[PDB]
Design a protein around this ligand. Structure first.
Ligand SMILES: Nc1nc2c(ncn2[C@@H]2O[C@H](COP(=O)(O)OP(=O)(O)OP(=O)(O)O)[C@@H](O)[C@H]2O)c(=O)[nH]1
Ligand SMILES: [Ca+2]
Ligand SMILES: [Mg+2]
Length: 153
């Protein structure tokens, strides 16, 4: 199995980003959706509502935030702090247009992140608004998780 944590400030869209990825098409403490992807074991997404048993055995993290909302960028460092040397940089950050883009647009439709977070691959994300093909980053993320393990031997 592979367990990928979905963390992010409240109302950011981490639930909305989740069911799209797990195939199926308001807040809640935790919602684990099951799906499986095959290219070239199981994939379970743990949408956390905006913990220490949650962080356990975690293999990757997807941060989701609203780029219109001020201070969100530094709120991820806590989700980075808490759920985190648990993860390495396998993390993914979604600059998620939940609203018609006003501020995100332009020279950072993915705004500047903290130094620890930057250097983690970032994407412009939204289901209706301008976005990046982030199902591909997911597929590519799942593949990068499994391969590492028995590669070491
Ligand atoms: N138009 C539009 N609205 C979106 C989009 N994604 C999220 N939203 C807005 O955000 C709401 C859904 O976001 P959620 O997934 O519930 O937010 P969350 O990250 O789960 O945050 P919590 O409340 O803590 O669970 C909807 O009411 C939408 O209005 C989107 O792609 N397009
Ligand atoms: Ca696009
Ligand atoms: Mg949610």
């Amino acid at each position: 199995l592979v367990k990928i944590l979905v963390l992010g400030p409240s109302k950011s869209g981490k639930s909305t980003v989740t069911n799209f990825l797990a195939g199926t098409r308001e807040t809640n403490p935790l919602r684990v959706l099951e799906v499986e992807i095959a290219l070239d074991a199981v994939v379970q997404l743990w949408d956390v509502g905006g913990w220490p048993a949650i962080a356990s055995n975690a293999d990757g993290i997807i941060y989701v935030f609203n780029p219109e909302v001020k201070g969100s960028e530094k709120e991820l460092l806590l989700w980075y702090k808490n759920f985190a040397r648990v993860t390495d940089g396998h993390s993914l950050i979604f600059s998620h247009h939940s609203s018609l883009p006003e501020f995100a647009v332009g020279d950072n439709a993915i705004p500047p992140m903290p130094k620890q977070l930057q250097g983690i691959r970032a994407l412009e994300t939204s289901l209706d608004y301008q976005s990046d093909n982030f199902k591909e980053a997911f597929d590519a993320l799942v593949e990068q998780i499994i391969a590492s393990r028995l590669a070491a031997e």
